[model samples]
Target: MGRNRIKKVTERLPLPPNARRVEDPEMNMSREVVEDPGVPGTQDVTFAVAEVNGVETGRLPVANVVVTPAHEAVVRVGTKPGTEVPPVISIWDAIAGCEAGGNWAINTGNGYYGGVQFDQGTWEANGGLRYAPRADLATREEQIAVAEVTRLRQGWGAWPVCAARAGAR
Candidate 1:
């Protein structure tokens, strides 16, 4: 039942039109099936069985490094380079029933705030929540930059499950 919902969401996500066979031995596939050059695939690939606020929900991957036309559009809207963390967080908020139509700015339970979904704990850990002026809650770049900085400082892995460079635009 829950798996069906996740499938629905994944099907609706805006992923790249083309697909390439990656070199990961885990999948037992060939390596020649790589994206042409710069095409961005969908970010939602796997599912994490968990409950948010007592409601069972799926957590999709937030990072997408492919620089496709769609990706460019997201970037124009404010998402940073490498990963579409902003969009992922935005979708998560909606699924979690947390200000779906509003924007980022989530209360991650750990203390992050504003866009990039920083919690109070994350904010203080990163040297306070006043890093960016005006909050810039709606900008994707600002949020992602903060996330990247945090990832670097915390040594968290930032990778995209799908191929980053797909050909044929």
Candidate 2:
């Protein structure tokens, strides 16, 4: 949408420590799609691709996705050469989805909850019940915290999927 709109969304969710706002007026959408990790005998794409709907998308390396102060969306590809991208999603999309159906509803049966896609089990394993019946994922802080913990637990060895090569800065 716009910078004002993004701020509104971010205000609802807990912002991560390293999270920073980019300054692009054109940015409207952002995502942090993790690589599948191309380990031998695995089906992960060794190279990272920021694709939208399976097409080779721009914003190479996609280390982080940011919406500029001007409202333009841009992908921060990498910090060094092979650092993993941060976990993030479009505030706009999250808001829209929350409105259309219900944010963090466990009944979707999609296996994931919240804007960042916390799976059903993941939500339960974490402190989800603290805000159950609503799942509390709608709260940005809880969503970010739970997902961050989940990623940390995965270790650098297995992220995005099991048996995948996890890299660190």
- Cα deviation in Å at residue 125, candidate 1? 3.0
Shift in Å, residue 87, candidate 1: 16
TM-scores for the candidates: 0.25, 0.29
Candidate 2: where are CA atoms >4 Å away? 1-108, 133-137, 156-169
List, residue by residue over 26-64, the lDDT tens digit for candidate 1: 221111233344344444433444555657675655334
RMSD of 2: 21.8
- In model 2, state the lDDT of residue 61: 28
User: How well is each residue in 30-72 modelled by candidate 2, as lDDT tens digits?
Assistant: 2232233222221211224345555545432213333222222
Overall lDDT per candidate, in order of appearance: 0.38, 0.38
RMSD of each: 20.0, 21.8
